[PDB]
Design an enzyme around this catalytic site. Structure first.
Site, mmCIF file in Angstrom:
data_model
loop_
_atom_site.group_PDB
_atom_site.id
_atom_site.type_symbol
_atom_site.label_atom_id
_atom_site.label_comp_id
_atom_site.label_asym_id
_atom_site.label_seq_id
_atom_site.Cartn_x
_atom_site.Cartn_y
_atom_site.Cartn_z
ATOM 1 N N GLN A 88 0.858 -1.179 0.000
ATOM 2 C CA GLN A 88 0.000 0.000 0.000
ATOM 3 C C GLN A 88 0.899 1.235 0.000
ATOM 4 O O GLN A 88 1.820 1.346 0.812
ATOM 5 C CB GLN A 88 -0.901 0.004 1.236
ATOM 6 C CG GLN A 88 -1.671 -1.296 1.443
ATOM 7 C CD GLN A 88 -2.777 -1.493 0.425
ATOM 8 O OE1 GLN A 88 -3.699 -0.684 0.332
ATOM 9 N NE2 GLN A 88 -2.692 -2.574 -0.342
ATOM 10 N N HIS A 144 8.414 12.770 -21.418
ATOM 11 C CA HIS A 144 9.499 13.602 -21.940
ATOM 12 C C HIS A 144 10.845 12.949 -21.615
ATOM 13 O O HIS A 144 11.712 12.802 -22.493
ATOM 14 C CB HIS A 144 9.397 15.012 -21.330
ATOM 15 C CG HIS A 144 10.503 15.953 -21.723
ATOM 16 N ND1 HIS A 144 10.297 17.048 -22.535
ATOM 17 C CD2 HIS A 144 11.810 15.989 -21.366
ATOM 18 C CE1 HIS A 144 11.435 17.702 -22.687
ATOM 19 N NE2 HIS A 144 12.371 17.083 -21.983
ATOM 20 N N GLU A 145 11.021 12.535 -20.362
ATOM 21 C CA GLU A 145 12.289 11.922 -19.961
ATOM 22 C C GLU A 145 12.548 10.585 -20.662
ATOM 23 O O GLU A 145 13.657 10.342 -21.154
ATOM 24 C CB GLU A 145 12.383 11.742 -18.442
ATOM 25 C CG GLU A 145 12.128 13.009 -17.606
ATOM 26 C CD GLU A 145 12.906 14.223 -18.072
ATOM 27 O OE1 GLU A 145 14.003 14.068 -18.643
ATOM 28 O OE2 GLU A 145 12.397 15.339 -17.858
ATOM 29 N N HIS A 173 13.756 10.974 -24.175
ATOM 30 C CA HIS A 173 15.183 11.238 -24.339
ATOM 31 C C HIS A 173 15.944 9.924 -24.561
ATOM 32 O O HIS A 173 16.877 9.874 -25.363
ATOM 33 C CB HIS A 173 15.755 11.981 -23.128
ATOM 34 C CG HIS A 173 15.533 13.461 -23.153
ATOM 35 N ND1 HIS A 173 15.891 14.251 -24.226
ATOM 36 C CD2 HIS A 173 15.010 14.298 -22.228
ATOM 37 C CE1 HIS A 173 15.595 15.512 -23.961
ATOM 38 N NE2 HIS A 173 15.066 15.570 -22.751
ATOM 39 N N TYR A 193 23.073 17.030 -27.926
ATOM 40 C CA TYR A 193 22.319 17.932 -27.040
ATOM 41 C C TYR A 193 22.846 19.370 -26.997
ATOM 42 O O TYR A 193 23.139 19.920 -25.929
ATOM 43 C CB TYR A 193 22.241 17.336 -25.628
ATOM 44 C CG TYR A 193 21.065 17.802 -24.795
ATOM 45 C CD1 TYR A 193 19.765 17.527 -25.175
ATOM 46 C CD2 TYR A 193 21.265 18.487 -23.602
ATOM 47 C CE1 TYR A 193 18.693 17.922 -24.395
ATOM 48 C CE2 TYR A 193 20.192 18.900 -22.813
ATOM 49 C CZ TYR A 193 18.910 18.609 -23.220
ATOM 50 O OH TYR A 193 17.846 19.009 -22.442
ATOM 51 N N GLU A 216 15.000 18.205 -27.745
ATOM 52 C CA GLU A 216 14.016 18.716 -26.794
ATOM 53 C C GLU A 216 12.582 18.702 -27.330
ATOM 54 O O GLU A 216 11.660 18.286 -26.626
ATOM 55 C CB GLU A 216 14.386 20.136 -26.357
ATOM 56 C CG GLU A 216 15.307 20.143 -25.150
ATOM 57 C CD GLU A 216 14.680 19.409 -23.995
ATOM 58 O OE1 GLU A 216 13.532 19.752 -23.648
ATOM 59 O OE2 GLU A 216 15.315 18.483 -23.450
ATOM 60 N N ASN A 258 -6.997 15.243 -18.554
ATOM 61 C CA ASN A 258 -6.698 16.670 -18.708
ATOM 62 C C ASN A 258 -5.604 16.956 -19.744
ATOM 63 O O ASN A 258 -4.650 17.676 -19.456
ATOM 64 C CB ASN A 258 -6.295 17.287 -17.365
ATOM 65 C CG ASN A 258 -7.378 17.159 -16.314
ATOM 66 O OD1 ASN A 258 -8.562 17.323 -16.602
ATOM 67 N ND2 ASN A 258 -6.974 16.857 -15.085
ATOM 68 N N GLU A 279 0.468 21.950 -23.379
ATOM 69 C CA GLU A 279 1.370 22.631 -22.457
ATOM 70 C C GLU A 279 2.313 21.599 -21.848
ATOM 71 O O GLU A 279 1.988 20.407 -21.820
ATOM 72 C CB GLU A 279 0.581 23.323 -21.344
ATOM 73 C CG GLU A 279 -0.473 24.299 -21.839
ATOM 74 C CD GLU A 279 0.144 25.517 -22.486
ATOM 75 O OE1 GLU A 279 0.724 26.355 -21.762
ATOM 76 O OE2 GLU A 279 0.061 25.630 -23.721
ATOM 77 N N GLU A 328 2.449 21.399 -16.718
ATOM 78 C CA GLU A 328 1.433 22.155 -15.990
ATOM 79 C C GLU A 328 0.983 21.489 -14.681
ATOM 80 O O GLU A 328 0.600 22.179 -13.730
ATOM 81 C CB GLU A 328 0.222 22.461 -16.899
ATOM 82 C CG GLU A 328 -0.635 21.245 -17.264
ATOM 83 C CD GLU A 328 0.022 20.320 -18.295
ATOM 84 O OE1 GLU A 328 0.968 20.747 -18.989
ATOM 85 O OE2 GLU A 328 -0.426 19.161 -18.428
ATOM 86 N N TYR A 382 4.076 22.202 -12.092
ATOM 87 C CA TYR A 382 4.705 23.522 -12.107
ATOM 88 C C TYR A 382 3.940 24.542 -11.256
ATOM 89 O O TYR A 382 2.713 24.650 -11.344
ATOM 90 C CB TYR A 382 4.818 24.009 -13.555
ATOM 91 C CG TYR A 382 5.641 25.265 -13.773
ATOM 92 C CD1 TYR A 382 7.013 25.272 -13.536
ATOM 93 C CD2 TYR A 382 5.048 26.431 -14.253
ATOM 94 C CE1 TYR A 382 7.769 26.411 -13.754
ATOM 95 C CE2 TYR A 382 5.793 27.567 -14.474
ATOM 96 C CZ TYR A 382 7.152 27.554 -14.222
ATOM 97 O OH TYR A 382 7.891 28.695 -14.444
ATOM 98 N N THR A 383 4.680 25.286 -10.436
ATOM 99 C CA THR A 383 4.133 26.397 -9.637
ATOM 100 C C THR A 383 2.770 26.118 -9.003
ATOM 101 O O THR A 383 1.740 26.598 -9.472
ATOM 102 C CB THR A 383 4.051 27.713 -10.450
ATOM 103 O OG1 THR A 383 3.264 27.505 -11.628
ATOM 104 C CG2 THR A 383 5.440 28.168 -10.860
ATOM 105 N N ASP A 398 -0.689 28.122 -15.583
ATOM 106 C CA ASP A 398 0.595 28.304 -16.252
ATOM 107 C C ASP A 398 1.287 26.967 -16.501
ATOM 108 O O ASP A 398 0.744 25.906 -16.200
ATOM 109 C CB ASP A 398 1.496 29.265 -15.469
ATOM 110 C CG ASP A 398 1.923 28.707 -14.129
ATOM 111 O OD1 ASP A 398 1.292 27.736 -13.662
ATOM 112 O OD2 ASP A 398 2.894 29.237 -13.546
ATOM 113 N N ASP A 441 21.974 27.404 -21.781
ATOM 114 C CA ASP A 441 21.056 26.288 -22.021
ATOM 115 C C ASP A 441 21.513 25.438 -23.211
ATOM 116 O O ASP A 441 20.710 25.019 -24.054
ATOM 117 C CB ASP A 441 19.634 26.844 -22.223
ATOM 118 C CG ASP A 441 18.582 25.757 -22.401
ATOM 119 O OD1 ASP A 441 18.676 24.698 -21.745
ATOM 120 O OD2 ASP A 441 17.645 25.979 -23.192
ATOM 121 N N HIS A 453 16.156 24.273 -24.787
ATOM 122 C CA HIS A 453 14.801 24.362 -24.243
ATOM 123 C C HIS A 453 14.085 25.623 -24.692
ATOM 124 O O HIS A 453 12.928 25.847 -24.326
ATOM 125 C CB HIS A 453 14.816 24.338 -22.705
ATOM 126 C CG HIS A 453 15.336 23.063 -22.120
ATOM 127 N ND1 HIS A 453 16.654 22.901 -21.743
ATOM 128 C CD2 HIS A 453 14.716 21.891 -21.840
ATOM 129 C CE1 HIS A 453 16.824 21.677 -21.265
ATOM 130 N NE2 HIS A 453 15.662 21.047 -21.308
#
Ligand SMILES: CC(C)C[C@H](NP(=O)(O)CNC(=O)OCc1ccccc1)C(=O)NCC(=O)O
Ligand SMILES: [Ca+2]
Ligand SMILES: [Ca+2]
Ligand SMILES: [Ca+2]
Ligand SMILES: [Ca+2]
Ligand SMILES: [Zn+2]
Length: 316
Positions: A61, A142-143, A146, A157, A166, A183, A187, A190, A193-194, A200, A226, A231
């Site tokens: 669990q 995304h990872e 790569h 890269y 990227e 959802n 983007e 999302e 993030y923040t 955003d 970068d 990116h």
């Protein structure tokens, strides 16, 4: 480890309940034997030595706060495996069912995630810029993408090849997010993030300029930050991909959308059959045009739309 396949239950970073594939041998481990040669999730214990310890749990669990990033890294790696197998007939990142390994709780306050050449790695974030990054399905995909890139095109890269690298990860991260169908959007990041700011994201594919990234080749970054803007300049290719799928008129150039599935087929073929470690944006355009030609024919709408999209972002 050697053991019997089991099914645990827990809660992810966003508080959602999900089942996860585990392995029982004294403890229940985050080892999913149902996919290829396994998906394995590790605890880095706030340190930076990798991979850390294979995640062990006494009761199968996984509802503790500390468990949440592991639950999501493990589960979303499974979804991403399924997308590549079911949609592209690709077995894991190497095409031969390589074991997929992820470590969570990497370092302290770590606002990033990465593929280190051998495995995926997720920070917990500092609670302000990010919450634990495996909570984003687009991030996990995304990872892992790569790794797919590294085993296929091998895009270096930095500079333009790195920006393509990227964009490929953002494109497939997004297509995996649509595949899971919770959802979905165009983007990036999302969900993690923040947490204090609604609406955003880290990047936008539909409108890269919203977060300061270029949406036209004339606005490309050519400084050294970068890795030469990998990116940043990805926005130019992300915009082209968005246009190919969804259509639109961008700087006066109209693109007829052909949908996500065809976008995915075209870019997967480009990635695996045409791109090389040194491909630039112009060469990506050529690869995508050739890929669409192979799949749909020279006179097809699909080919015309690929051309329109690259025209729209100023890539010839
Ligand atoms: C989807 C995101 C939430 C995470 C995503 N992480 P990423 O692109 O995999 C980070 N890349 C990275 O660390 O590459 C450097 C590296 C690390 C290890 C081996 C070789 C090269 C990102 O956009 N990071 C932003 C950034 O690093 O600027
Ligand atoms: Ca437990
Ligand atoms: Ca979303
Ligand atoms: Ca997203
Ligand atoms: Ca936010
Ligand atoms: Zn990346």
């Amino acid at each position: 480890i050697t053991g019997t396949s089991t099914v645990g239950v827990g809660r992810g970073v966003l508080g959602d309940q999900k089942n996860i594939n585990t392995t029982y041998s004294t403890y229940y481990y985050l080892q999913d034997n149902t996919r290829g040669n396994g998906i394995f999730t590790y605890d880095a214990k706030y340190r930076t030595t990798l991979p850390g310890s294979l995640w062990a749990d006494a009761d199968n669990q996984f509802f503790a706060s500390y468990d949440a990033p592991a639950v999501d890294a493990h589960y979303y790696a499974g979804v991403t495996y399924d997308y590549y197998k079911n949609v592209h007939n690709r077995l894991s990142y190497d095409g031969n069912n390589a074991a997929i390994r992820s470590s969570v709780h990497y370092s302290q306050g770590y606002n990033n995630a990465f593929w280190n050449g051998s495995q995926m790695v997720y920070g917990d974030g500092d609670g302000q810029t990010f919450i634990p990054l495996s909570g984003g399905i687009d991030v996990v995909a995304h990872e892992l993408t790569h790794a797919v890139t590294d085993y296929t095109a091998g895009l270096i890269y930095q500079n333009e090849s790195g920006a393509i690298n990227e964009a490929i990860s953002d494109i497939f991260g997004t297509l995996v997010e649509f595949y899971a169908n919770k959802n979905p959007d165009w983007e990036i990041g999302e969900d993690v993030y923040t947490p204090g700011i609604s609406g955003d994201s880290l990047r936008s594919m539909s409108d890269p300029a919203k977060y300061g990234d270029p949406d036209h080749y004339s606005k490309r970054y050519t400084g050294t930050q970068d890795n030469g803007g990998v990116h940043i300049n990805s926005g130019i290719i992300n915009k082209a991909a968005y246009l190919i799928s969804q259509g639109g008129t961008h700087y006066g150039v109209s693109v007829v959308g052909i949908g996500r599935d065809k976008l995915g087929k075209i870019f997967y073929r480009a990635l695996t059959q045409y791109l090389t470690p040194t491909s630039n944006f112009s060469q990506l355009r050529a690869a995508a045009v050739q890929s669409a030609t192979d799949l749909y024919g020279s006179t097809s709408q699909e080919v015309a739309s690929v051309k329109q999209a690259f025209d729209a972002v100023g890539v010839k």
